[PDB]
Design a protein around this ligand. Sequence first.
Ligand SMILES: Cc1oc2ccc(-c3cc(N)nc(N)c3)cc2c1C
Ligand SMILES: [Cl-]
Length: 330
Amino acid sequence: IVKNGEKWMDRYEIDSLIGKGSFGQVVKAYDRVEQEWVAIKIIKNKKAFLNQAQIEVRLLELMNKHDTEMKYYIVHLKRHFMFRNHLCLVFEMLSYNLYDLLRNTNFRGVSLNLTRKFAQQMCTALLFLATPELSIIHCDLKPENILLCNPKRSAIKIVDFGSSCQLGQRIYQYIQSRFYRSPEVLLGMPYDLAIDMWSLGCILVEMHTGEPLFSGANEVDQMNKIVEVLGIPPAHILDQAPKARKFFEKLPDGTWNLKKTKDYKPPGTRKLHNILGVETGGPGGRRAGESGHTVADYLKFKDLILRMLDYDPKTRIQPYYALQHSFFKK
Ligand SMILES: Cc1oc2ccc(-c3cc(N)nc(N)c3)cc2c1C
Ligand SMILES: [Cl-]
């Protein structure tokens, strides 16, 4: 829709398309005033996309005014304008995304040491979004929405607040990308910032193994793959879940079981300790005898992930406490 030389408002010179999504397009452009390259998110000229992007602008401007630190793992919105009836959001330029990074490993994963560096930045971002006066739920964390700041370095920023909402400003029941969708959302329950911690746990396993932890083809398959690793969810959760009976069945003594389909490993027997290869040289044994990949290192990582993948969103580890975990201690 935009030529690779087009000039906007005697300020921006469009170079190239660097991204696209349901929302519209992302272009690289030169800002003559700041004398720098910028990324311009161009929203489709349709009401549905405009209105949701106006929420995204509001949440990014809310973050910008909380300049008392920990805000620097979120992509910086520089400004926004209307042009040709497109809402346009101007960001700093970043580099390539963590899915691209995994693709580049041939989906064999990055080291525990680089996974730790990503985990510490993402926990810090989630600590910032949990600041009471922000209380922002990202709602679509996944490798594609985490970008390197610089192709030479391991700094990252989160992008895409297109699904995001403040606590108590929920619009959609059906949210998150399926692989990274929290049990509370699959179960149709009111959700809070804990869904992002669930996503992050899924993401960190994937960054190290090269493969998604829970690759469901649909919601029923998604919940079944979660149950393979983590077992049947606690009764107290299932007793409150509008969609419990999408996946489970309640028995005489207040117990729940999987709804069985026509012919999964039995509940809780696909152990994260074997996905990670804690005692077997890491994922597919590919880290056998590499530095920083000892059994003790792996056990700390496994402990932290199992805290991120708590079924109970009330007891699931929170960002501050994740940052104090021994996985991050030198
Ligand atoms: C290189 C680069 O730099 C970027 C900076 C911001 C965003 C961006 C994309 C979407 N969908 N939402 C937001 N908030 C930012 C995308 C990019 C890309 C791609
Ligand atoms: Cl385990």
